[PDB]
């Protein structure tokens, strides 16, 4: 969860990307916009003789 | 015969000829996968980066 500069409309709560997953949320206690990024990943390869 | 257009140009950082530079400028290579190295993707921007 990272701080974001998205300009939410006052009636809007959640934000959606192209794939229709949740990308930006609004914190319900303090009115702040948070971006959701998936955690770090990648491929693993083994080079061996 | 003049071969200066297809012979390599040492002034360029990558040793490519004038016609090769023209072709590389004509093709817009949009599939740059591992150039990002996931750091620029981890820094999230409001613009929709494909
Ligand atoms: C062979 O062709 C090249 C390119 O046409 C000539 O080199 C010069 O190239 C520049 C562009 O980088 C042109 O603006 C110049 O007009 C070209 N000529 C000169 C005299 O500078 C090169 O001279 C040609 N060589 C021969 C033997 O024909
Ligand atoms: C809305 O647009 C203005 C100017 O067009 C820009 O400064 C601002 O950052 C935008 N808000 C966003 C991208 O959330
Ligand atoms: C309760 O929610 C309101 C809504 O904005 C907020 O201003 C206030 O700080 C919250 N109080 C606590 C104790 O979290």
Swiss-Prot record, chain B:
Name listed for the protein in its UniProt record: Spike protein S2
Region Disordered: start-end pairs: 29-50
Sites carrying sugar chains: 2
Sequence segments annotated as region (Fusion peptide 2): 36-50
Region entry Fusion peptide 1, spans: 17-38
The species this protein was found in: Severe acute respiratory syndrome coronavirus 2 (2019-nCoV)
Function recorded in the entry: Precursor of the fusion protein processed in the biosynthesis of the S protein and the formation of virus particle. Mediates fusion of the virion and cellular membranes by functioning as a class I viral fusion protein. Contains two viral fusion peptides that are unmasked after cleavage. The S2/S2' cleavage occurs during virus entry at the cell membrane by host TMPRSS2 or during endocytosis by host CSTL.
Site feature Cleavage, where: 16-17
